Amino acid sequence: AMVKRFFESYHEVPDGTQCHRKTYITTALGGICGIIGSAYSVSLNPADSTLEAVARVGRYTFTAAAIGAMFGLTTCVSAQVREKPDDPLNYFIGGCAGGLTLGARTHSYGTAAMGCVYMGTAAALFKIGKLEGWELFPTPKV
Amino acid sequence: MNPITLAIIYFTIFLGPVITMSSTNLMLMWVGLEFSLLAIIPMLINKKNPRSTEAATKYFVTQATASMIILLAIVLNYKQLGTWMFQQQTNGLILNMTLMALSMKLGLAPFHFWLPEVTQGIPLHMGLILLTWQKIAPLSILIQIYPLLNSTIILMLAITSIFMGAWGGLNQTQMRKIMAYSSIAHMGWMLAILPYNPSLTLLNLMIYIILTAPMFMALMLNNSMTINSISLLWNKTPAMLTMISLMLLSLGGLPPLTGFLPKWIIITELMKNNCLIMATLMAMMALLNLFFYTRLIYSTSLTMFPTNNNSKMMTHQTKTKPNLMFSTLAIMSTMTLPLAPQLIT
Amino acid sequence: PFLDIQKKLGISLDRHFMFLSAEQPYKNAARCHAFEKEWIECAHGIGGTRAKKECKIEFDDFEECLLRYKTMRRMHDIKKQREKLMKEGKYTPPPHHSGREEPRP
Amino acid sequence: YPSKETAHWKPPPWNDVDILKEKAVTNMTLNFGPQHPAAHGVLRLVLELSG
Amino acid sequence: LRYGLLAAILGDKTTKKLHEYSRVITVDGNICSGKNKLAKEIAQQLGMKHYPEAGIQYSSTTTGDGRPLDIEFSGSCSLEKFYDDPKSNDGNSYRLQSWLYASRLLQYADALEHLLSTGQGVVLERSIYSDFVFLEAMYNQGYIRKQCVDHYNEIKRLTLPEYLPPHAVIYIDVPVPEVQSRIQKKGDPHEMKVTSAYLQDIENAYKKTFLPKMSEMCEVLVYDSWEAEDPTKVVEDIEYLKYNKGPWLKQDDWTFHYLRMLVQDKTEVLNYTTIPVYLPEITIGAHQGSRIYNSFRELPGRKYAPGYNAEVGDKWIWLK
Amino acid sequence: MNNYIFVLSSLFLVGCLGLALKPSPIYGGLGLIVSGFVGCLMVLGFGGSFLGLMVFLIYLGGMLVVFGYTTAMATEEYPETWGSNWLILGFLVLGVIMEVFLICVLNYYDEVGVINLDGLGDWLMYEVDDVGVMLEGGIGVAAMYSCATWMMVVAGWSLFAGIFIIIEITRD
Amino acid sequence: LDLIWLEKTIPKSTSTLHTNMTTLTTNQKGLIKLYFMSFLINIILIIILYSINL
Amino acid sequence: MMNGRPGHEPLKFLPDEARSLPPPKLNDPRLVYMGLLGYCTGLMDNMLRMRPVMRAGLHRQLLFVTSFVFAGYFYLKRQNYLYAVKDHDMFGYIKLHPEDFPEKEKKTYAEILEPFHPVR
Amino acid sequence: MPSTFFNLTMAFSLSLLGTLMFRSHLMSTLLCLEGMVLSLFIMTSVTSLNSNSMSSMPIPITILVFAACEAAVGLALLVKVSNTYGTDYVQNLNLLQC
Ligand SMILES: CCCCCCCCCCCCO[C@@H]1O[C@H](CO)[C@@H](O[C@H]2O[C@H](CO)[C@@H](O)[C@H](O)[C@H]2O)[C@H](O)[C@H]1O
Ligand SMILES: CCCCCCCCCCCCO[C@@H]1O[C@H](CO)[C@@H](O[C@H]2O[C@H](CO)[C@@H](O)[C@H](O)[C@H]2O)[C@H](O)[C@H]1O
Ligand SMILES: CCCCCCCCCCCCO[C@@H]1O[C@H](CO)[C@@H](O[C@H]2O[C@H](CO)[C@@H](O)[C@H](O)[C@H]2O)[C@H](O)[C@H]1O
Ligand SMILES: CCCCCCCCCCCCO[C@@H]1O[C@H](CO)[C@@H](O[C@H]2O[C@H](CO)[C@@H](O)[C@H](O)[C@H]2O)[C@H](O)[C@H]1O
Ligand SMILES: CCCCCCCCCCCCO[C@@H]1O[C@H](CO)[C@@H](O[C@H]2O[C@H](CO)[C@@H](O)[C@H](O)[C@H]2O)[C@H](O)[C@H]1O
Ligand SMILES: CCCCCCCCCCCCO[C@@H]1O[C@H](CO)[C@@H](O[C@H]2O[C@H](CO)[C@@H](O)[C@H](O)[C@H]2O)[C@H](O)[C@H]1O
Ligand SMILES: CCCCCCCCCCCCO[C@@H]1O[C@H](CO)[C@@H](O[C@H]2O[C@H](CO)[C@@H](O)[C@H](O)[C@H]2O)[C@H](O)[C@H]1O
Ligand SMILES: CCCCCCCCCCCCO[C@@H]1O[C@H](CO)[C@@H](O[C@H]2O[C@H](CO)[C@@H](O)[C@H](O)[C@H]2O)[C@H](O)[C@H]1O
Ligand SMILES: CCCCCCCCCCCCO[C@@H]1O[C@H](CO)[C@@H](O[C@H]2O[C@H](CO)[C@@H](O)[C@H](O)[C@H]2O)[C@H](O)[C@H]1O
Ligand SMILES: Nc1nc2c(ncn2[C@@H]2O[C@H](COP(=O)(O)OP(=O)(O)OP(=O)(O)O)[C@@H](O)[C@H]2O)c(=O)[nH]1
Ligand SMILES: [Mg+2]
């Protein structure tokens, strides 16, 4: 299916190159998390209106999109200014910029600190995962 | 209820899982799931008050909807292959719909929101039945088709259940909810290892059952639903504190208690398959279980909460509980780690 | 099963009507009895994982008899190619396809 | 842990028996007559009915 | 064979045991209105078991050796201190009242279990249905707080509905000016300090709440003093009641069965009186609470379950 | 007559669309009777007979009871009908548009696999013993008394237990 | 350092984070209407996930 | 894993071929620990019921010890058989597919150049 | 047959949507659980007839047998929900959040 092809366009070319293509992908990827988050949010903790419902969907999806766009750019920009593609420190800088964006959109200095560290480490481990070939959901071997 | 009703209703509750477990045909497996659903309902709603009626209703509409989805899988499969059992050639989407429906029946998150509430509205002994015996039927179906299950669905459900069970249980002052979220978390462990080694899912189920049974029996001793109710145990049944504490640490997976064995062997077998990331998060969120189990231990055995005047009458009286099963299950559920090699295989 | 009690006691509560080629009332074969009886005998004793590859010929034939995907495809193509010819005017069906045969017997 | 939205939650009752505001008992009020073959002409029998 | 389902299924059924005098009779009235004498002759004449009014020491004398316990083991409250200082800030008043409800609730289960297991009727002086009159009197005079009244109504709401009510209620109406005189000719120095405004409030609760509440389920008999002073007159009034209302009509073998499982299990009876609601009046710190609990377990015959105390001459322990 | 089965299954679909929008259970019970009747006609078209009339019989007694329960427990002052609310009326109309779209679409991208509008009717009955005698669905359903007696034990026990189950659920 | 910033960064922020999550995911309204509505989202996500892996 | 192996009888506790394996010694460290788990149960039972922990109900305590050793003896015998079968199937597999488990010649340290890592 | 199963299967999906999307009445959600039983019964009946598998025709009857019991048990519960609040509205069944 195509929609799977698109998300695999992110790793056809070494990091730091085709920078906007990557920024677009992680921006869509963040939006998909924001939409899935809103769906549960509005359904489980329903709002008082219906416009107010749609507002919360827009607020989560743009915020989630913003995090993804700041991650996929800062990672690709750092990965080429330093000329160091196969390097987890790139994804730690991008993941933190993502964390900073989350705090910026939430009016919370505390979230920015937690977001910068927790998401930066999560982003770094994703890179270290692809280098060493760790699988999230392996299939039964034994 | 009169003895005829109990004999009929309790036999049917027992009959259901035995039909599901002994059946080759899928429709007879479904039939056993129906027997359990129907016969438990009168037991749940026996006290007949506003809360057990809501509990028996939420349970019925959840478990009936899940039943219909399972039946659709059994029927779409008969259309595809002209047979009443799942094959290696069964369509992929047919299997996934079975998995989601069964997890809805087990209470696995994110299909879990019903379980803590239903456990809350019913008496303690029916919570014991619901959180233990009632899990064997859906699980016995799943173990029969483990070569077919998509592991990505199974691990997302298990990771979700371990997280939601930890976070949910951390906020609860009602003991019956603490037991439901305890159940949700443990089902995450049973399910995570299912497509790899179904024998370890049976070990984790059995150890969970013999830990969850005495824990309920311990709360049924004084009919204690809250953290403040259970805090009076030092002035009511102080002889019980030694084994409540160990069982709670044992439910928490702390060494060298029997409850460490299931988590430890599941993690070991998950990493035999290179399931490193999932295994690490699972073990790291199991730590949160120990925190709110520790908080319970703080309130009961390691401190003495204030007690009331009327509890002095309680001491003048003589209790005929617990029975010989509580002691047998308490010791086996805590002091059996040195027999680990005889339990795994 | 999970508790092979039926196999242990040697009875058959529900084992005898598992699939199409099972015994039917008044010895009425089911549709695709021949193919299924072949597939179940092919995959007998070699296990599920071996059978998925080594009895692919038997299975794909049973799957075709049961669901007839290729048969409908093929008869769709013949009828659709004939539709095209008749619109152009390069084919008029035979008398025995237009409702004027000499019936048998 | 208190959160602003659950600030109104109450602990459940000690025996699961929740007090409920008394339910409205309404019966069907039916006119039985005057024009009715059994009213014997001029009876307006107003009946309160449950079933 | 302890009573249980298997005991019922094999024949132990209540409805066989009941006869015309398998009744619960409660004699009510004010302080010094003659309940002791009247309740004792109703029981003796009708062949019913008499249960003297449950007091501070009711559960001390039904367990162990039946001897009164030091007041710390038995409720840490004093009726005498209630009359000497009814507003003391040590919470005596509501501690006394809360303890008295629990002991009455236990005596009721003891009385009912006797009724349902043998068929013999019981006569009780006051009960858990009239107990509240004393509570309402305390609150009207300012002797307890509003929170104490909430805590009483909560325990009552969790325990009273579980039980069947009395078949008959025998109120004895004595006006306060006569009551106040009887207390003075009784003798107890402390009981003579009771205010007449407190006695009146006991009489108002009785006539404005107890009797209208019970007439909806029980046969109620109201006797002025002179009518009650001849108990034979009251018993002849009881031999001819019809009992045509109340929950006892809708009872069968299996409603009785589950009531008999409740009342034979005294920890189940008393369960809800001990709920963790933290009124300073009744709450006890762990230090005092643990000191008391440990001292109690060193009492003769209280250290182990009845039958395993070698001190008090128990035998065959290594086989029990 | 080549579209016959397709139309019955299309009517069945709507009956469950109307049912899913959940108007007053008086009308939800009316959709189940018409879907029950439509579905009965499908089992008849495919050669059934006993199975067709039974599901029609059983759902006739179920909606009789359901009607009695609606007038007692699930009735409000202004029962909702499919036209009662503009929003439901929108999704009933829109729901019919979608099927006209899904059928037309899915028919465009496969032509045979799922919906084969070009060949409706050609593939209804696959085989049939032309000289048969013992072929009624009743004979197959009647096997519960000889061959699949296990089916009847669980079915009989299900109903037997149910009487005990409901008497306790509804008990005062 | 010890009394303030070393508390704030490790033990205090870890307890703040997890208290934050247990608050979001536990405040449910108890309405079966909303639960099934989420069960509906779950089912669609599994359909979508399986769809893009064909 | 071993559910469907050949000759596997259904719900057979101790198949016949288990009788070729040496039995558990009666004073097995594993059986003895069962005896102690039984004894503790009898002690815990007396504690929960408020009875003299060690003096009271020795008939019960004896039967708790006997029950756990008896059951543990037969359960141990079954796990020995299951473990014996595992090796049996594991080794016979090595024999039937030698090309998959090749014997390897491991060079001696004279021929191996392990890199040296100074600790300065 | 191909066109019939697609329409029947979509019929089951619409009722699953109806069951999962509550409105006020609990009785209406019970009728959707009967829309699903009817769809499954018709699929099984058509499958068995098309393949000429007479030995599977007992199975569609058991589905009806075990579907009535739910309808009976569902209606019995609906009586207890009405005896408490006087209606069958689902929004009333929410005491158990606490
Ligand atoms: C290259 C590195 C750049 C580092 C900066 C990027 C991270 C920025 C994090 C911003 C975090 C939140 O940002 C901050 O939120 C506070 C919330 O208190 C808001 O602040 C405003 O509202 C708050 C109330 O909440 C008032 O108390 C405050 O005086 C006012 O300025 C602003 O939005 C911003 O001051
Ligand atoms: C070797 C020791 C190293 C010590 C390191 C010290 C460096 C600390 C840098 C932290 C700078 C960010 O400063 C951040 O301030 C905010 C103030 O709102 C604190 O956070 C606080 O406010 C936020 C709002 O933003 C709220 O969520 C909440 O009330 C609380 O968390 C964070 O916990 C802290 O991380
Ligand atoms: C904000 C913090 C978040 C931290 C994470 C950072 C995420 C940024 C990276 C974007 C990743 C895109 O995600 C992309 O998913 C696809 C899904 O097939 C993965 O695809 C991989 O797994 C699939 C399994 O389905 C294999 O079949 C495939 O051969 C392989 O490429 C890609 O390897 C990954 O690149
Ligand atoms: C608990 C499992 C073990 C028991 C196994 C099952 C066998 C039980 C045998 C004992 C049977 C006693 O069960 C018996 O049931 C009947 C109804 O059937 C009850 O009787 C009931 O119906 C009769 C009908 O005339 C009326 O008097 C009344 O409505 C009620 O008492 C009896 O009170 C009880 O004695
Ligand atoms: C092959 C057939 C298999 C049959 C299996 C039988 C399993 C055993 C079932 C045991 C059931 C008895 O367990 C149950 O005990 C509890 C006490 O804990 C009683 O429950 C009790 O709860 C509270 C206090 O405890 C009372 O207010 C209530 O009225 C009463 O019901 C139940 O009335 C009884 O049913
Ligand atoms: C409750 C509402 C019910 C309304 C349901 C819809 C009823 C109408 C049925 C529409 C189904 C398709 O209906 C009709 O099918 C035939 C064959 O079956 C299609 O196909 C027909 O024309 C094609 C060419 O296009 C030729 O191959 C041939 O003549 C025939 O197959 C027609 O193009 C279509 O008009
Ligand atoms: C404890 C709860 C359960 C107790 C209640 C259930 C008891 C069992 C009663 C149902 C008995 C069914 O009994 C079972 O019938 C089937 C067919 O009907 C027989 O099975 C037979 O099926 C067909 C008959 O045409 C033959 O092809 C087949 O070879 C033969 O085995 C079994 O040999 C018999 O064991
Ligand atoms: C991956 C897991 C790794 C982390 C391991 C889990 C460690 C446990 C951390 C979560 C639990 C700690 O949660 C912590 O509970 C304390 C208990 O006082 C709460 O603090 C609370 O104290 C008391 C009583 O609880 C309340 O009166 C007060 O208002 C509130 O602040 C904190 O707000 C919360 O931060
Ligand atoms: C898209 C065309 C295809 C057919 C679509 C219809 C499929 C069947 C759907 C059945 C469910 C209807 O879904 C409906 O969702 C709405 C919210 O939108 C909810 O309905 C609730 O909110 C709406 C909107 O204010 C109110 O009109 C309604 O009275 C109230 O109950 C119910 O949960 C459910 O009745
Ligand atoms: N505060 C309080 N005092 C009580 C309660 N029950 C009894 N008492 C007191 O304890 C004493 C019990 O004696 P009573 O039975 O009421 O009066 P009496 O002297 O014995 O006269 P008769 O019993 O009627 O024969 C009374 O002085 C009461 O004041 C109670 O529930 N609350
Ligand atoms: Mg006295």
Side-chain angles (χ1 to χ4, degrees), chain B residues 11 15, chain C residues 10-13 16 23, chain F residues 146-150 153:
Chain B
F11 178 73
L15 192 74
Chain C
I11 62 180
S12 181
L13 290 181
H16 60 278
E23 176 157 353
Chain F
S146 52
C147 298
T149 45
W150 183 236
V153 171

Side-chain angles (χ1 to χ4, degrees), chain E residues 30-37 53 79 82-83 96-97 100 104 125-126 131 134 138 186 191 198:
Chain E
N30 204 319
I31 303 173
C32 297
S33 68
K35 299 191 304 301
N36 300 344
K37 176 185 296 211
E53 198 171 331
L79 187 66
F82 166 63
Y83 289 143
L96 172 67
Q97 193 52 39
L100 281 173
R104 278 194 227 277
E125 311 167 22
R126 298 207 178 89
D131 187 272
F134 283 103
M138 289 205 187
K186 187 193 189 185
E191 185 177 289
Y198 175 74

Side-chain angles (χ1 to χ4, degrees), chain A residues 69-90:
Chain A
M70 202 54 48
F71 164 85
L73 177 64
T74 306
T75 307
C76 170
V77 167
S78 299
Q80 77 98 29
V81 165
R82 295 162 26 92
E83 301 175 339
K84 289 279 279 297
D86 279 309
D87 175 80
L89 177 57
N90 291 323

Side-chain angles (χ1 to χ4, degrees), chain B residues 10 14 47 125 220, chain E residues 268:
Chain B
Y10 274 120
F14 165 75
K47 307 301 287 287
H125 73 275
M220 282 193 275
Chain E
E268 181 63 1

Side-chain angles (χ1 to χ4, degrees), chain E residues 133-295:
Chain E
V133 308
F134 283 103
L135 178 83
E136 300 289 319
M138 289 205 187
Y139 177 60
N140 275 33
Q141 303 302 303
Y143 301 166
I144 59 183
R145 316 183 305 165
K146 175 56 173 64
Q147 296 87 265
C148 301
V149 173
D150 285 4
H151 179 264
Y152 186 98
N153 301 341
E154 195 62 80
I155 284 171
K156 200 184 202 217
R157 201 190 67 82
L158 296 155
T159 43
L160 199 65
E162 300 291 351
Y163 304 90
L164 290 160
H167 288 88
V169 171
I170 295 175
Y171 184 71
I172 304 177
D173 197 6
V174 180
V176 176
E178 167 61 1
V179 165
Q180 185 84 63
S181 300
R182 296 186 181 192
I183 289 166
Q184 300 278 325
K185 298 167 59 182
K186 187 193 189 185
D188 168 64
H190 307 113
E191 185 177 289
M192 297 198 190
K193 300 187 200 203
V194 57
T195 308
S196 64
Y198 175 74
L199 287 169
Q200 182 64 33
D201 281 336
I202 296 164
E203 190 206 346
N204 289 339
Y206 259 135
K207 287 171 179 304
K208 290 170 164 43
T209 316
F210 178 65
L211 288 162
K213 175 75 186 97
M214 294 306 254
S215 292
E216 306 211 326
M217 58 189 70
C218 310
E219 280 282 51
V220 172
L221 306 174
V222 190
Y223 299 100
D224 302 325
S225 171
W226 70 267
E227 303 183 321
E229 280 181 290
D230 187 4
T232 308
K233 293 283 184 281
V234 172
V235 164
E236 289 165 359
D237 212 358
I238 293 169
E239 295 164 352
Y240 288 108
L241 285 173
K242 284 303 101 181
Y243 306 119
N244 280 322
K245 75 202 77 56
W248 288 85
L249 305 185
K250 313 183 258 288
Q251 305 293 314
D252 52 329
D253 281 330
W254 298 111
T255 53
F256 285 139
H257 167 77
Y258 295 110
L259 191 61
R260 187 165 171 182
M261 301 303 297
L262 170 53
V263 300
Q264 81 180 1
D265 201 335
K266 308 309 206 192
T267 49
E268 181 63 1
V269 171
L270 292 158
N271 183 46
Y272 286 114
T273 69
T274 65
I275 55 169
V277 167
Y278 301 119
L279 287 174
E281 275 84 348
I282 53 149
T283 304
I284 302 175
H287 301 298
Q288 167 166 327
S290 40
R291 172 187 55 79
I292 284 163
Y293 182 75
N294 285 318
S295 302

Side-chain angles (χ1 to χ4, degrees), chain B residues 58 61-62 65 91-93 96 100 104 110-113 117 153 164 167-168 170-172 285 288, chain G residues 17-19 21-23 25-32 35-36 38-39 42-43 46-47 49-50:
Chain B
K58 284 181 180 185
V61 296
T62 310
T65 315
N91 188 254
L93 184 64
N96 299 330
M100 79 180 49
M104 193 182 180
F111 306 86
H112 73 285
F113 301 102
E117 298 189 21
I153 315 312
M164 301 281 106
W167 281 328
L170 184 66
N171 198 30
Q172 300 309 322
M285 290 304 292
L288 268 169
Chain G
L17 159 62
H18 288 279
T19 316
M21 311 313 294
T22 196
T23 286
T25 71
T26 288
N27 302 331
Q28 305 309 332
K29 278 49 179 174
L31 291 166
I32 189 64
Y35 293 161
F36 275 28
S38 94
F39 299 167
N42 300 324
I43 286 156
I46 288 167
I47 295 279
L49 166 163
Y50 169 91

